[PDB]
Amino acid sequence: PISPIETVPVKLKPGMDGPKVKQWPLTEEKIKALVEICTEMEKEGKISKIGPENPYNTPVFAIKKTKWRKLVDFRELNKRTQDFWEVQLGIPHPAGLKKKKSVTVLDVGDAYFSVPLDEDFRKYTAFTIPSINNETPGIRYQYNVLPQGWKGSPAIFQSSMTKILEPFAAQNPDIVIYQYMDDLYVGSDLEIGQHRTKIEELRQHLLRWGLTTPDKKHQKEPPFLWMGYELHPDKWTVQPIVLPEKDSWTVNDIQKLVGKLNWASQIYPGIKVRQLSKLLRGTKALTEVIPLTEEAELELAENREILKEPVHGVYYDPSKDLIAEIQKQGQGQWTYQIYQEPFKNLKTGKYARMRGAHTNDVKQLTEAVQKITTESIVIWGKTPKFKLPIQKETWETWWTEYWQATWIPEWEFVNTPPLVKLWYQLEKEPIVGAETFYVDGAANRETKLGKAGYVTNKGRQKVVPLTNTTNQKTELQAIYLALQDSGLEVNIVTDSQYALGIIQAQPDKSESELVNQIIEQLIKKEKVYLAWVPAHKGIGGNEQVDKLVSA
Amino acid sequence: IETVPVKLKPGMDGPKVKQWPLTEEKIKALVEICTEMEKEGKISKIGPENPYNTPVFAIKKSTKWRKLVDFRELNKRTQDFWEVQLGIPHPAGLKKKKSVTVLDVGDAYFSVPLDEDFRKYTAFTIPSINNETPGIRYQYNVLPQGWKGSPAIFQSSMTKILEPFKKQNPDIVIYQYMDDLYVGSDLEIGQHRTKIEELRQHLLRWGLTTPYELHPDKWTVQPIVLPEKDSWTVNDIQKLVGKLNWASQIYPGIKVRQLSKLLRGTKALTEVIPLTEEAELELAENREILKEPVHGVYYDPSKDLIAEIQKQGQGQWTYQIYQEPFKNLKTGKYARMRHTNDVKQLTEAVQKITTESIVIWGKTPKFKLPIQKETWETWWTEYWQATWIPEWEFVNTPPLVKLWYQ
């Protein structure tokens, strides 16, 4: 328990002083329990009794289950102590763990109480044990070690543990020690004999620095239930995922459901959550019951089918290559596997998009490659080679013409449909022999009524009326009109920067029904050229359609 | 030596910026670099009681890895120190010179102790793979490369070292920006290059070790070009009328009344329409209005510079620098021969624009980059060679302004 470790210095935040929080009374059955606990902790150096000079006090409580435990409320002191370098906010991912012959799990007991607490900072931990009915002054006590529930303890313990391990690691440079809260995980490829030896020797090193470690009879055994995972000597998978069945669905219930599914998706290939999360767009209230859509019902039912099957992932070998394969898995949903030898997956994942109202497949595929490249560096420190269902000509045509800069990595074509394809492609030059439609639309911003019209060079003209619309949507409806009323080749001329931008981006899927209709039309056309002219400049064709639609 | 005290602008806490994850190769290079730096006293390990962090990266300027620290946040929080209390002035004549060489003098900062009460704000982390270990944590004991306080403090010594040389060569301009020396002359190139080697030898023999030719007499706002064609179709006149309409936001004296008349009526897009003589004269007069430059565009040192970049295809990129829209201080076009990709090209262009910007005004612009953020955050170090880092954001709107700036 006690320890010759050096102490980390601690300050309160500048211009603050220590906490003086008055102590609430106790049932005096617990007041007896605290006295026994405090006298034990005193005898082990964990705390010391203090005089009246100490003005600070932090509330102390007591609580039972079999046995009792002391609980201190450091919330006031925590608010007042300096900041620390936050301890690791992530955990290692099993798909990144390197395979190892033998692995041992050591928990360290009373870990915090084993590490000393900076001397000048001890006064601000003072607590007080109450005397029955204020019949006498209480007992003053302060901490000498890292108190449980204080802000500094997780970081000071961790840095302490690192330094303590350092000499042992220098002398045994071929055994791996992951460190994670009050745990150590030790692996080696030594003969299970010598491995069991080296472990016992490291236990002894830790005990010299005051860290109790479990006996061979008490060291946990595989499979390991760790952070929602199940680790096996040669494979890993998640812990069982139980999706509730319910007739009414609360917002809080939907959040808990997307989370559970998200967790399953890292090894259960195929999971989808796009429609389920669309529901959650109403973050308004957590109890407000959201009526499940019919797309959401289909999604959930498909997830339940896959969850019924069991599945597992493997561990990482740095000598074998790293490969990522991606498949189209719905409308705007994508799924991927990462592996080193086929069917022996390290892990899986998904990619849906909230990028904007309209996108297309090639852009989404590129966005997915990006997400994987980020993930692989975090997990293995390198990028995979990619196996993708798209041909070089499809992708090269897209990235050369795309206004944004993209980096496409090492990849190869895989002939497993659905393939990623450009459904249509606008012309670059006007079309000879094709009718030229001059379109325009308009709306009254108050009355919210409007009209879409065209005028062509063969003398045809048309106006179609529009109710409950906006100026932007009518400029799109004019475009849609011209595709409807044209032959298989058409030139269109628009005044609308909005509408030009949206079509020049060659979307193939949209949140808007109108854009989805235009997309249906653009596919069936042999050739479409779209051209822009500035509005209200009397160009020729725009002026007429404007006069026709505007008044 | 003695250490000059430093202070953040009051009511500011030090930087707490997240460390990006790194390739194992980049981490291995950082560990080896920091092991040696620690063996030489320049940095030391730190404990959990330091909550500060500033991101670090590994690049190549050469086949040897180098360490680059992103002090943008710490710079924004010390700016009393290096902008006013210890500003290093910018000379307006550097842009006029005919040759300008950049010399890296950052290594000389490592000979000067840093204020013991400021070192904690320089903390940084070498990350581990897959959160296996918490990173390795260090702070600086000497003046760091990349912190704008470093040239500010070293300024006195730099003036002493250079004073001989400026006496000998009074027509040579020397400007310092962060870790670099910009040295400009009107000499012939061969004479200029040996004058630069003299200054190298001078700096070296006084203990300041050092390891790029620019010609700011070519830089200018590029004037707009209208197409010159033999057979104009209706579509061609519409593009031309549209481009000229756009240009009237800048040059007040342009009109297309005579040019739109040739489209009167509702005509097919592919119809060849000949240019009448009054139309041809209106277009030719507009080509003269475009040659002359704009008036009324003055640099305002208080305001932020902004750079916009658009991808033109075939390895070509256009850019504008301005502080108010349509008031372009500088417009230009970059090209990349053959063995290149989009991110490599954008990264290179960003560095050329930032250099031009430093020469002309002594400050770096804030970029609007046409690229997805996570793609940039992943690949920008693969081609980054400079020692400074401008601010940036990612613009997801592709205006038709592409065709116009071509």
Ligand SMILES: N#Cc1ccc2c(Oc3ccccc3OCCC(=O)N3CCCC3)cccc2c1
């Ligand atoms: N409860 C818990 C817990 C246990 C061990 C962990 C663990 O083991 C290792 C400890 C040291 C070195 C390598 C290690 O992984 C090797 C991969 C391998 O072959 N395994 C079979 C079962 C465990 C993993 C690593 C990370 C977290 C662990 C968390």
